[PDB]
């Protein structure tokens, strides 16, 4: 199988959020069968995309995690070939590798807050209420397709720490009501 190829990132670097794509899809495809991507990588989050699905990922103290269901085990295309997962775990939907250089990590958050933002491929900075360890309401319902190909992506606090890893949405005849984290203490735990 190929590796995993950032294709694009989500730019919060200053008051307006939106997303870029830095491969196209060609590109992607060769780059996943040679696991060599010579791209310069910048910010926090990364769109990612395998042959078949595409899905974000988020550098949190060094590592850029993503989900299991969507990298499975594969390796990161990177200038020197393909780098292999320094975390896997299945039961927790979780993997990461190595940082890419260039890329910019957030910060685990110490605050304690329940008023949680979710951002999207799209670049949508989504408020969400947290509502248990795991998962949180969307102030704003919508329909979950506006949510698909956003895990991997950060739910960050009112100071822009993180706070998860967004896995999985709760849906109801389609509408996301509520999403469901990995939160970012089993990430400093995995650590
Ligand atoms: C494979 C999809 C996973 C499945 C189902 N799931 C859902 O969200 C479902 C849906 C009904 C919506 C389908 N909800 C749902 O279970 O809710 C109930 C409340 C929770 C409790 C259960 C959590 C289970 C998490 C999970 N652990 C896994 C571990 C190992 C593994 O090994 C193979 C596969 C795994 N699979 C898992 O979950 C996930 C999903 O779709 N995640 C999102 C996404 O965007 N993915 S993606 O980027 O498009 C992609 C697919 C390209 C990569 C964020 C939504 C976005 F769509 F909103
Ligand atoms: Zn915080």
Known sequence: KGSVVIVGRINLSGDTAYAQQT????????????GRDK????????????????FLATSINGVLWTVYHGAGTRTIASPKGPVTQMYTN???????????????????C?????????????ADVIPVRRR?????????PRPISYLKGSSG????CPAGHAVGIFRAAVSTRG???AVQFIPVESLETTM
Do not use: F, M
């Open 23 to 34: 491969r196209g899809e060609e590109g992607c495809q060769e780059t996943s069968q040679t």
């Open 90 to 108: 299945v039961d927790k939907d979780l993997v990461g590798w190595q940082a890419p250089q260039g890329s910019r990590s957030l910060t685990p």
């Open 39 to 54: 791209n310069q990588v910048e910010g926090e989050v990364q769109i990612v995309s395998t042959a078949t699905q595409t």
């Open 153 to 156: 992506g950060p739910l960050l």
């Open 132 to 140: 248990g360890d795991s998962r949180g309401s969307l102030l704003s």
């Open 110 to 122: 110490t605050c304690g807050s329940s008023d949680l933002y979710l951002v999207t491929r799209h």
């Open 175 to 177: 509408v996301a009501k």
